[PDB]
Amino acid sequence: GNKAAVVLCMDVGFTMSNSIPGIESPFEQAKKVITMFVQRQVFAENKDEIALVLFGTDGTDNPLSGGDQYQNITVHRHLMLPDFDLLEDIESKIQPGSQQADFLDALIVSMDVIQHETIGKKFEKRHIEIFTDLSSRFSKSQLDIIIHSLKKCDISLQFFLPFSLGDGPFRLGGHGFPLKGITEQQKEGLEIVKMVMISLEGEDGLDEIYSFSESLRKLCVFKKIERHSIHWPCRLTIGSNLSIRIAAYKSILQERVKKTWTVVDAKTLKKEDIQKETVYCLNDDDETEVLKEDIIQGFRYGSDIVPFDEEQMKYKSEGKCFSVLGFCKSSQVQRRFFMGNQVLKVFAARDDEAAAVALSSLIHALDDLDMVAIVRYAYDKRANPQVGVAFPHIKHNYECLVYVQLPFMEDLRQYMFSSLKNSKKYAPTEAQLNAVDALIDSMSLAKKDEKTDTLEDLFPTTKIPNPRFQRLFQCLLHRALHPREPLPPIQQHIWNMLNPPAEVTTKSQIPLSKIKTLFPLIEA
Amino acid sequence: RDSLIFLVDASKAMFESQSEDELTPFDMSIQCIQSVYISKIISSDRDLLAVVFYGTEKDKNSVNFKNIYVLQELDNPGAKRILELDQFKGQQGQKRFQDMMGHGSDYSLSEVLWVCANLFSDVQFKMSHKRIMLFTNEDNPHGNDSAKASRARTKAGDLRDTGIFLDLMHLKKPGGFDISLFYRDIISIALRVHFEESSKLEDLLRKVRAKETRKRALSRLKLKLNKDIVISVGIYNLVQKALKPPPIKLYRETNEPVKTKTRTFNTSTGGLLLPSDTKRSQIYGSRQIILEKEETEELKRFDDPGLMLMGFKPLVLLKKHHYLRPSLFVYPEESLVIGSSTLFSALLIKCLEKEVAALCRYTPRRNIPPYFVALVPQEEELDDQKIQVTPPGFQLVFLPFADDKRKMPFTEKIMATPEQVGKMKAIVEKLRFTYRSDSFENPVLQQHFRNLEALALDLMEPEQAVDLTLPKVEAMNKRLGSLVDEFKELVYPPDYNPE
């Protein structure tokens, strides 16, 4: 909520220069991921202090070089706010090495970086990564110290590897090496990795060991320093004697860019030399200037018109309120009738066990009875009241009321579309059934998992990060590093992470041909 | 534009409440037309709303036929027209109406339709639709003379022949209302099983609002299965926040529309700037980045503009609290691509039979970075009155991306003992009701528009709207009784501080 202190630890030993054709070398993948991280940590103008530590080099640069220990530990950039020096370094002047380094020594070095450099700096979170292929031998002695200072210096971790924890053209960042296509040293390293991750986080550790593809299509690199939401306190009241003291958070709040394209003169490249003049004249012909004193504040009404106690006759509300109207079956609060550019999750307030009991009772009663509250909601005294459905949502980890605003009668727009199923000019042919059914069975993005019962989704498109952000950040970076050259085309981990797994396309190739042969389309 | 003629029947029939609490069908008609007028003023739509009566004694029209009173010629709605129609609200409203408009006067539908055609004749604006929204609860108005029926039928055929639609919003007649007798072939059948006899206000009001508005494609796109197989659909947005329309500042003295230019010239020479003379800039720290406007609107092209199909994930995976922004509605526009409706019908049928969406990638227009949308199928819903309350087609859902979905803290999930859940089930069941989509109506819009209407006729104080969205707290407490006390002593300590 104030600052984070990240410490990237790239591996660049000779093993990661293993550039198998068709597959990105692990080194270039690490470059791609750290470009993603630092781009979105500089351009979004976050205040996170990154320190890059590069191991695998030929030289030595760290506070632990003494005693001829910690070779190939080059502290490329100590803890300071990230700038464009780093983003030029990441792809111009950072190159592989011929050594193979002890990444546990890299962890101990990074731990030293954070524990020392962050002495005069107040940080809320301390985070660390590693980008290793795990092809170096190492000694596990100091492991005892690692953990023995990790939790005691309050430092998280995250591990990145060229292979997952669970073939064909390796679409980087796509939606697919084999776990049996690795070496024994890699397996031993991975066992140590899993050991430390468990020792830090229980079973939740093995969700922290991401691939390099998989990290290009997730916000996993940011996952552990993301800004905490803001608790909106309020009171969910039924009647006037059932007041539940709750806190609501925003959940699905669409994300857009925070810098607008300032306009500046094409030659002197300044803004103040421009101004915008919006003066008032008669809009009809005979365009005469009309002064500000000649202009007053007026509303239309069908044909008639009104000018404009007056300023003070604004509507009034009864203050911040999260009260109920009345509960109704969850088969009548459809989803096509949601408004508002947000969603809220309503928890019972913190430090209120009784309030939690009450809201949990409310949630469970709603879920068992199969029906949802239709509450009224007003952000603060100066807000437009709105009625929205608050419907139950119980996770194994927490219970909450998901709020979504609902329409009014003067928002909807009842149209009348002619019937399709009842239509006669589009008679039901066997083509309908056979062709479209085959197509649908092909392109399914869900498969029943290894346990034949439960359903995994191949392509979880609520989990990709927004492509426009990395496109924009690539282009801004490129113009900050190549001022004389045009913008690049879109990268390939992007164009891949916005596409279905190739399995889908391959299986669907033939049904599509059937459709094109069978359903004649012709434009006018 | 679009002109519509509420062609009310003023005969004796409409004034005959069928011994019930409901309103006399003329009164439902007037409350309905007042509602349509106020509505068409809420949206700031400019369409034209005429009110006509037939079957009365007096007449105020163009050609002065018998018993045809054009109470308002084709013009935009305003405060005066709303108040004039309001004068016929309630029993006293019928009383006033039967004073300067005697009921029960013979007529001929041929002549009234000719009058309406002439109402359309005088105007000259390019109006896209012309519909006469006849209100009648008489199955065979010409049941006593064949010649009158023949001329009426020929006239209606002519009106449809000139591009005038002829609705029929029949009302609740005793013994039913068999449209087959006389009104079989008067209504422009663009099949289409007709509505039910409107019984009370709300049914008629919704049928009117569903027959007057016309679908406006929020855009027209191509849904693409591959490089080649492309169908052409229309994205209609069926719901959007109707904002309190913004003020127009007018010339102070004469109250005329005014202009608001955008003149952006140099602070040195004064010459207005061609867009080619300015580059788009952005600053980060002490560093600055400059690039041309075309290259700040083309660090975006991902797709052509349109829906391009990508998979069919079953509906169970499309969660309900993953809502990003209001959903749209995709329906085939078979005008462009001959045969698109057929394949769309096939896809909807067999997306329904298999409970499976269609996850696509949606780019509204050129130079926009796509979202991932999910076309969730949905099938028609001919309600108990034969309205269409859930039209056939692919609802289009916007799925967030991991930058959107925020991550919330949590404290240990505490759950209540099923005793408490049972008592809250009791409290829950004391407040049940049947929410229906068009139930509540905004406070701010209605309050502000009544404020306006008061200021549109120089009234002392405006009509404050009696709020609906408030909790009916007194009645609702009296409904629960002592249940709330039981719950409170169950869960909260004796010395709890909820404030």
Side-chain angles (χ1 to χ4, degrees), chain A residues 43 219 228 235 239-241 243 251-252 254-255 259 261-264 266 273-275 277-281 283 287 290 293-294 296-298 301-303 315 318 323 325-328 335-336 339-343 347 352 357 360-361 364 371 376 391 393 397 399 409-415 417-419 422 426 432-433 437 440-441 443 446 459 461-464 466 471 479-480 495 498-499 512 516 521-523, chain B residues 41 77 213 215 222 228-230 237-240 242 247-252 258-259 261 263-267 273 277 279-284 287 291 295-296 299 302 310 312 314 319 321-324 331 338 341-342 346 350 354 359 361 371-372 378 380 388-391 397 401-406 409-410 413-415 420 428 432-433 437 440-442 444 452-453 469-471 477 487-488 492 496 498-499:
Chain A
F43 288 20
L219 292 187
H228 172 267
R235 303 180 99 240
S240 58
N241 275 339
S243 80
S251 172
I252 311 312
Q254 179 163 174
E255 186 72 350
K259 297 299 291 295
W261 293 99
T262 312
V263 176
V264 297
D273 309 328
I274 313 286
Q275 56 284 0
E277 272 80 4
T278 78
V279 188
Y280 309 104
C281 313
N283 210 358
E287 185 175 330
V290 295
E293 189 265 328
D294 298 329
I296 62 170
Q297 184 74 30
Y301 192 100
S303 191
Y315 170 63
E318 61 266 20
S323 66
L325 308 188
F327 307 161
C328 79
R335 185 171 152 171
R336 53 206 197 76
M339 291 325 178
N341 218 316
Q342 85 201 318
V343 169
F347 294 161
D352 294 73
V357 175
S360 187
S361 49
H364 282 288
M371 61 160 198
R376 163 156 182 290
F391 62 90
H393 181 248
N397 192 359
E399 306 165 342
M409 182 205 168
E410 59 269 15
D411 283 20
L412 316 172
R413 263 181 295 181
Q414 192 148 105
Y415 295 105
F417 304 77
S418 67
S419 287
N422 310 337
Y426 320 94
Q432 313 263 10
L433 189 153
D437 189 358
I440 300 153
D441 289 330
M443 291 206 218
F459 174 35
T461 186
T462 80
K463 203 163 288 308
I464 300 164
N466 199 7
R471 183 81 188 88
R479 268 288 200 290
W495 256 106
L498 322 178
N499 266 328
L512 299 173
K516 213 157 96 185
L521 297 95
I522 51 179
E523 193 157 334
Chain B
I41 293 175
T213 187
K215 58 169 82 75
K222 303 212 142 183
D228 193 309
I229 297 169
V230 288
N237 59 340
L238 288 183
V239 311
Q240 75 183 358
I248 302 187
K249 302 152 200 170
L250 294 174
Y251 182 76
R252 154 167 282 196
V258 188
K259 183 166 64 59
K261 66 182 59 53
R263 262 210 174 197
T264 63
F265 37 80
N266 294 289
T267 189
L273 271 43
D277 291 331
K279 294 297 190 99
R280 300 280 161 281
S281 172
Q282 269 185 312
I283 287 166
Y284 292 105
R287 178 68 163 257
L291 72 164
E295 290 187 344
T296 54
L299 61 78
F302 286 83
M310 291 186 28
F312 283 68
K319 301 202 192 171
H321 63 298
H322 281 153
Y323 159 85
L324 185 74
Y331 181 101
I338 287 169
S341 172
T342 300
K350 296 279 194 322
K354 321 195 88 174
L359 183 78
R361 191 171 34 185
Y371 290 97
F372 271 106
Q378 89 186 6
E380 58 193 9
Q388 192 162 268
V389 291
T390 287
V397 176
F401 295 153
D403 318 297
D404 304 335
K405 308 187 304 201
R406 313 221 171 278
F410 63 74
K413 174 218 189 172
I414 293 167
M415 187 179 310
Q420 294 179 356
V428 158
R432 187 202 211 82
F433 80 82
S437 167
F440 313 122
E441 279 137 31
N442 210 334
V444 297
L452 196 165
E453 190 147 311
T469 73
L470 281 153
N477 294 115
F487 198 87
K488 232 162 177 173
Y492 295 12
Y496 197 68
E499 181 64 25

Side-chain angles (χ1 to χ4, degrees), chain A residues 467-512:
Chain A
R468 79 195 286 270
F469 278 74
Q470 294 88 19
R471 183 81 188 88
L472 158 65
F473 290 139
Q474 155 184 36
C475 286
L476 263 49
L477 177 79
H478 191 290
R479 268 288 200 290
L481 302 197
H482 291 69
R484 312 266 61 87
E485 300 157 41
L487 302 174
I490 304 97
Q491 291 181 355
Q492 293 297 109
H493 57 102
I494 287 173
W495 256 106
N496 293 324
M497 93 184 176
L498 322 178
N499 266 328
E503 310 166 345
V504 191
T505 317
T506 59
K507 293 181 189 176
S508 56
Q509 295 309 268
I510 303 92
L512 299 173

Side-chain angles (χ1 to χ4, degrees), chain B residues 3 43 48 87 89 141 155 175 195 206 222 232 244 249 264-265 277 287-288 292 296 303 326 359 379 462 473 497:
Chain B
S3 286
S43 83
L48 296 162
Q87 295 305 342
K89 157 186 277 167
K155 266 295 299 178
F195 286 15
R206 258 178 272 141
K222 303 212 142 183
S232 56
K244 152 168 174 164
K249 302 152 200 170
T264 63
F265 37 80
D277 291 331
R287 178 68 163 257
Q288 179 169 187
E292 49 163 351
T296 54
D303 303 69
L359 183 78
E379 192 186 358
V473 74
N497 189 3

Side-chain angles (χ1 to χ4, degrees), chain B residues 27-127 129-245:
Chain B
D27 182 83
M28 322 178 309
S29 165
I30 290 301
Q31 282 208 26
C32 182
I33 291 166
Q34 170 163 256
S35 296
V36 173
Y37 273 48
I38 181 62
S39 169
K40 294 273 229 187
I41 293 175
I42 298 312
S43 83
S44 69
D45 203 330
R46 66 220 293 194
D47 291 331
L48 296 162
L49 311 163
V51 190
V52 176
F53 299 81
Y54 77 98
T56 190
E57 298 186 15
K58 290 80 157 186
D59 47 58
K60 182 175 73 175
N61 61 7
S62 300
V63 193
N64 265 291
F65 294 153
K66 310 189 72 174
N67 308 334
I68 301 299
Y69 195 101
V70 173
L71 177 54
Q72 307 187 344
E73 282 266 10
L74 282 161
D75 190 304
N76 289 3
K80 296 175 196 176
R81 291 188 148 177
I82 287 168
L83 205 76
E84 180 190 287
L85 271 293
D86 189 300
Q87 295 305 342
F88 299 143
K89 157 186 277 167
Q91 178 153 6
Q92 64 276 69
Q94 177 177 286
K95 206 174 307 313
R96 275 81 62 85
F97 199 98
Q98 286 190 46
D99 291 331
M100 77 306 283
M101 321 275 268
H103 63 86
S105 195
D106 193 348
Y107 57 87
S108 283
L109 277 296
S110 60
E111 285 75 359
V112 70
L113 296 159
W114 198 352
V115 167
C116 307
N118 304 321
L119 273 71
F120 288 148
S121 162
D122 71 350
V123 304
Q124 318 293 15
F125 320 97
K126 178 61 72 170
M127 61 215 58
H129 305 80
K130 317 180 198 175
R131 314 151 70 63
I132 48 184
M133 271 184 78
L134 195 151
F135 290 16
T136 181
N137 62 334
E138 164 52 49
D139 62 345
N140 190 337
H142 295 168
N144 290 318
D145 44 1
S146 44
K148 261 197 210 181
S150 58
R151 56 180 82 240
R153 194 171 311 81
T154 62
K155 266 295 299 178
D158 305 311
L159 282 72
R160 292 184 282 161
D161 203 349
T162 178
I164 285 160
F165 311 130
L166 188 154
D167 296 330
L168 162 59
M169 301 216 88
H170 64 270
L171 299 197
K172 170 54 58 177
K173 185 179 96 70
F177 191 103
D178 62 358
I179 303 182
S180 68
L181 294 174
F182 182 76
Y183 295 74
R184 185 179 296 113
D185 47 357
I186 317 183
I187 300 98
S188 190
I189 293 162
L191 298 78
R192 285 91 184 101
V193 75
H194 207 198
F195 286 15
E196 285 282 326
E197 291 163 35
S198 311
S199 165
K200 61 188 179 305
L201 168 55
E202 285 77 3
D203 291 331
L204 189 69
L205 178 43
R206 258 178 272 141
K207 298 169 190 232
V208 164
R209 303 268 292 127
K211 272 215 170 299
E212 53 87 10
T213 187
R214 293 314 324 178
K215 58 169 82 75
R216 52 177 35 89
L218 170 59
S219 76
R220 197 149 297 160
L221 291 188
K222 303 212 142 183
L223 187 153
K224 322 196 269 203
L225 317 186
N226 63 340
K227 288 197 79 181
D228 193 309
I229 297 169
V230 288
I231 46 169
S232 56
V233 307
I235 306 300
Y236 309 91
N237 59 340
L238 288 183
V239 311
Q240 75 183 358
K241 186 187 203 166
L243 281 182
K244 152 168 174 164

